[PDB]
């Protein structure tokens, strides 16, 4: 009957680049989901396969809280059956996804006046990610027949590009913090 460390995920001072998303495993605790829903500090809070209002009266064997930073534009891709450089090359939800997706603007916290290039995304990949795949490889992408061998140049490009975040970016180009809750043998997470 210990409470779940949702604060440690949502209120974390450092979030991760979406290519190397973080996954907090949640077990052996009670979680009040309506407490999040009624925060009302979220711009996206869209649940697939379940009701937000009906979440508290439920149990699951394990809960996963995946969290990262993308840009306004791209939040629409954190949902099932989606295409794009995020959905395809960084973070993919399965079609039978049955959790919730939560997001809020983080310009005040995640953008710098000089430009904040710490957050990154993967731009070049030969094929899509399987759902909940995590690709951290920084091998030089090979765009042509002759092989790169770790030397950039023509047809040989670094696969990761950087979000430049500036507070003066337009809304869609600003950083959003995203937490995906996946709902998954005896149980350990209830309300």
């Amino acid at each position, epitope marked *: 009957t210990n409470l779940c460390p949702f604060g440690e995920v949502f209120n974390a001072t450092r979030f991760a680049s979406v290519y190397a998303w973080n996954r907090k495993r949640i077990s052996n605790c009670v979680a009040d989901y309506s407490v999040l829903y009624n925060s009302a500090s979220f711009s996206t809070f869209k649940c697939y396969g379940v009701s937000p209002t009906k979440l508290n009266d439920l149990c699951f064997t394990n809960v996963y809280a995946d969290s990262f930073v993308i840009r306004g534009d791209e939040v629409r891709q954190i949902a099932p059956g989606q*295409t*794009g450089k995020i959905a395809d090359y960084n973070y993919k939800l399965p079609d039978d996804f049955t959790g919730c997706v939560i997001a809020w603007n983080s310009n005040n916290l995640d953008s710098k006046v000089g430009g904040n290039y710490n957050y990154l995304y993967r731009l070049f990949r030969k094929s*899509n990610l399987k759902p909940f795949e995590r690709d951290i490889s920084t091998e030089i992408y090979q765009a042509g027949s002759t092989p790169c061998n770790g030397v950039e140049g023509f047809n040989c490009y670094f696969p990761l590009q950087s979000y430049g975040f500036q507070p003066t970016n*337009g809304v869609g*180009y600003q950083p959003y913090r995203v937490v995906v809750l996946s709902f998954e043998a005896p149980a350990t997470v209830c309300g």
Partner: antibody
Amino acid sequence: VQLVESGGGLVQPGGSLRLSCAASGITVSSNYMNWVRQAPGKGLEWVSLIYSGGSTYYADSVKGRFTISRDNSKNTLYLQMNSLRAEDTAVYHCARDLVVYGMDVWGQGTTVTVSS
Amino acid sequence: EIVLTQSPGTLSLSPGERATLSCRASQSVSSSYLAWYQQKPGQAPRLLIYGASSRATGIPDRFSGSGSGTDFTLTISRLEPEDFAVYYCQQYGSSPTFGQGTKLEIKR
């Protein structure tokens, strides 16, 4: 390093046509790939985009009528054009897209003509 | 969506002078995506600038990209005869869009 369009010719309105883009020096299945057309005396209009991983995107003007594909074994990008209208009359180019580094390789085009 | 408007429609000058072509986006826009292309009669476009300021390889020192936010600017410091073509700018949303082109013509 080349992109060589074929397939272009004369078509009746409502007909169809498949443009080919034989590539060499870049392998098509490993890149973002674009069809850009130019109508007589007019500008560049992006028309269709295909991801390395297979996702596709189209301009509203051709949505539902055009489909972009490829053939890894022939290193050839295709564009299938159905339900052709008088306005799809143009010179069609394939480019390779590096998104952040521009479209750095282009074809000289194939000319499509649509009329009755 | 993004709508790029290029000004002027036609720029007229003579060899040696400095051309300043302008690209205006309908909303605030990422500078990582703003390419400039050159097109000479009967020819496929040529990439001159990527990012917003980077010269593609093979592009001479005269060409130079600037701008951010919504206003971008291609500059040719000392025009040469071969520089009199049409010039297009480009941005990226979920897909490419282009400007309507600026004509570079010889003043007379």
